Design an enzyme around this catalytic site. Structure first.
Site, PDB file in Angstrom:
ATOM      1  CG  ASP A  35     -72.872 -81.520-101.179  1.00 44.79           C
ATOM      2  OD1 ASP A  35     -73.826 -81.139-101.852  1.00 44.79           O
ATOM      3  OD2 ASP A  35     -71.740 -81.476-101.624  1.00 44.79           O
ATOM      4  CB  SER A 199     -87.962 -80.476-114.301  1.00 42.74           C
ATOM      5  OG  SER A 199     -89.112 -79.614-114.537  1.00 42.74           O
TER       6      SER A 199
END
Lengths: 330, 6
Positions: A35, A199
């Site tokens: 995780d 991004s």
């Protein structure tokens, strides 16, 4: 040193992936969820309330010759979807894919919430976000990544998640066989504890790339791809039978449709998510409606590049003193 | 599904 392990999806929908970890001496193998969105290594144990344990393999510290109780320390943690565990802390030997760290804190679950008890296939989590997120009190404990970086051949690990197939986590080197083209790296901000990154924008199918900052997290331990509301609406505007469904929680569409691909920018490079990957699976076995793999982050409050996104890439978690994230196509 | 430390 390095480390190499196979990660397998827990189900036919890729809800999550497990990788076997060997804890304690002699080795007890548990199947953990690796995780990158948390920083606790925690396990179902001989300590866990009995009635809250269904199907999982437990860690019995009492049978480990190397285990020691970290005295005074507790932890308690809740996650994104509501679920939660707490308990006490041992340090012990933990090996992953033959890479071995001694004195690793191994958070022993005294209690687990219902969704953990319900999922027979996950025996615990191994956290791989920044150690600042570690919930142990009063002194926070380092992740297995942090603890291994003195001995790694390089301070990195890669995640090579498969589409309805196994894949790999590697520690301490980069398999130049597992990807195509070159990796592009982009900066990470550790200000909130995550693998957090910007991004440079997005395209739907064969339509134009739109330059837009989208800040978010690369999270191997969230299933889906959670985007701001307007980027998600732009995608499902391209699939004729998809609609927002309040009843199921998100965008659904006929299992019949061929979904367009979804492109996300990493600096000057582009990673294309094929459209089959965004077909999450039908809503119920036999239904004709299918659950969308790209959903609004509006509820969650922060964008998550989840398994739907990262499983179309080869991803390098660069844990040098200034960390970076690497994506390559594969 | 699953969203892992919010």
């Amino acid at each position: 040193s390095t480390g190499s392990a196979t990660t397998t999806p827990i189900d036919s929908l890729d809800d999550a992936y497990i990788t076997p970890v060997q804890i304690g001496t002699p080795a007890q193998t548990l199947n953990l969820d690796f995780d990158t969105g948390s920083s606790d290594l925690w396990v179902f144990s001989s300590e866990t309330t009995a009635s809250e344990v269904d199907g999982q393999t437990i860690y019995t510290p009492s049978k480990s010759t190397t285990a020691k109780l970290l005295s005074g320390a507790t932890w308690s943690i809740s996650y994104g979807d509501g679920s939660s565990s707490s308990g006490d802390v041992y340090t012990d030997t933990v090996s992953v894919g033959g890479l071995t760290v001694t004195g690793q804190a191994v958070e022993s679950a005294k209690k687990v919430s219902s969704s953990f008890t319900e999922d027979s296939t996950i025996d615990g989590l191994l956290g791989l976000a920044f150690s600042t997120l570690n919930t142990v009190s009063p002194t926070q404990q380092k992740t297995f990544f942090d603890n291994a970086k003195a001995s790694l051949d390089s301070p990195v690990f890669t995640a090579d998640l498969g589409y309805h197939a196994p894949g790999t986590y590697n520690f301490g080197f980069i398999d130049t066989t597992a990807y195509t083209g070159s990796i592009t790296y982009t900066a990470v901000s550790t200000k909130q504890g995550f693998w957090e990154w910007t991004s440079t924008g997005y395209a739907v199918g064969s339509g134009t790339f739109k330059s837009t900052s989208i800040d978010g997290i690369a999270d191997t331990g969230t299933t889906l791809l959670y985007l701001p509301a307007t980027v998600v609406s732009a995608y499902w505007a391209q699939v004729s039978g998809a609609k927002s469904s309040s009843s199921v929680g998100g965008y659904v569409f006929p299992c019949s449709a061929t979904l367009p691909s979804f492109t996300f920018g990493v600096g000057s490079a582009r990673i294309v998510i094929p459209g089959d990957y965004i077909d999450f699976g039908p809503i119920s076995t036999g239904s004709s409606s299918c659950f969308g793999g790209i959903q609004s982050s509006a509820g969650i409050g922060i964008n998550i590049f989840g398994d739907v996104a990262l499983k179309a890439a080869f991803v390098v978690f660069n844990g040098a003193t200034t960390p970076t994230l690497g994506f390559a196509s594969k | 599904x699953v969203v892992x430390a919010x």
